[PDB]
Ligand binder design. Structure first.
Ligand SMILES: [Zn+2]
Ligand SMILES: [Zn+2]
Length: 309
DNA sequence: CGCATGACCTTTTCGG
DNA sequence: CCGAAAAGGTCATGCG
């Protein structure tokens, strides 16, 4: 009772996955004809042993997800040759963003200082980072599709994107015009307070924040960008195509929105600057590790090394 | 009817 | 040789 698609009896691998003779036949025939199917719902129909033959579109979407391989189906020179060969979404994305950041009408200025004038300051740095991990995982689990993924792939997607997200969010909620950094827990510090912990990295962060805010990005669009930062292809994914199909929903989600209220980009034109910002982060953690004066805890060390392939 | 379905067939290769 | 794995081939059956 082993079939990755419909859960029927499976006694072999066909086109890459453990599959029943049925889902084998369906996949073969689909690809041989280039056939395209029409969902009469949300593109999420139930597909199990009895219901499989109803929404054809949704069966062939689940086939593709668990890892079945269009390429294995033979054509051209290998046609008819048998045997082994010789060798709303947008609303949820916004809700998830809003429930995970603090009420801007009630921040905390208890520590703020526009002219501050040591191991304690480096500790408070690690605390702001460890604080954001619980919350950014919270955010991720509320992206539609993410908690349906394999627990392995969730953990991989989170560790790969944690630093890219802590920065991107910090950059979108802070007030750079007044040198003001606002964290997830609503604390407020001036760049010059932060320099003790972040290093000169912070100056690079405030510059990004300037650029990003000077594009006046509405919350619906930011809400999608943050999703595309996390839900992306990575080495180690047990089920890539699932992650690929989800990324693809979110993109078309973002397109539909821009070709509506904003008329018929420049942001992704500095999505490379974000990756460069993050390496600058890693340089800082390496410095603190190697100084061995107050050492980053394992979990920090791990998740800064993990913003490379 | 004409067409999808799927249980069960034959074909190919490998390695002991 | 001959079995294991996994490609396409062959229809009888069910559907609308
Ligand atoms: Zn199946
Ligand atoms: Zn469907």
């Amino acid at each position: 009772g082993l079939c990755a698609v419909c859960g029927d009896n499976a006694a072999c691998q066909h086109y890459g996955v453990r599959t029943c003779e049925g889902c084998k036949g369906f996949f073969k025939r689909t690809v041989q004809k280039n056939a395209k199917y029409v969902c009469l719902a949300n593109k999420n129909c139930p597909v199990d042993k009895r219901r499989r033959n109803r929404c054809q579109y949704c069966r062939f979407q689940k086939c593709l997800a668990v890892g079945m391989v269009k390429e294995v189906v033979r054509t051209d020179s290998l046609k008819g040759r048998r045997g082994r060969l010789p060798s709303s979404l947008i609303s949820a994305l916004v809700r998830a963003h809003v429930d995970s950041n603090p009420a801007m009408t009630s921040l905390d200025y208890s520590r703020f200082q526009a002219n501050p004038d040591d191991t304690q300051h480096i500790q408070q740095f690690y605390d702001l980072l460890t604080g954001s991990m619980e919350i950014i995982r919270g955010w991720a689990e509320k992206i539609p599709g993410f908690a349906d993924l394999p627990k392995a792939d969730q953990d991989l997607l989170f560790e790969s994107a944690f630093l890219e997200l802590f920065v991107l969010r910090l950059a979108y909620r802070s007030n750079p015009v007044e040198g003001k950094l606002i964290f997830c827990n609503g604390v407020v510090l001036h760049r010059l307070q932060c320099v003790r912990g972040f290093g000169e990295w912070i100056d690079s962060i405030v510059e990004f924040s300037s650029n990003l805010q000077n594009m006046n990005i509405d919350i619906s669009a930011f809400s999608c960008i943050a999703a595309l930062a996390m839900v992306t292809e990575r080495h180690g994914l047990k089920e890539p195509k699932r992650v690929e199909e989800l990324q693809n929903k979110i993109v078309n989600c973002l397109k539909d929105h821009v070709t509506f209220n904003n008329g018929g980009s420049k942001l992704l034109g500095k999505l490379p600057e974000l990756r460069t910002l993050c390496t600058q982060g890693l340089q800082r953690i390496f410095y603190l590790k190697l100084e061995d004066l107050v050492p980053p805890p394992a979990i920090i060390d791990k998740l800064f090394l993990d913003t490379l392939p």
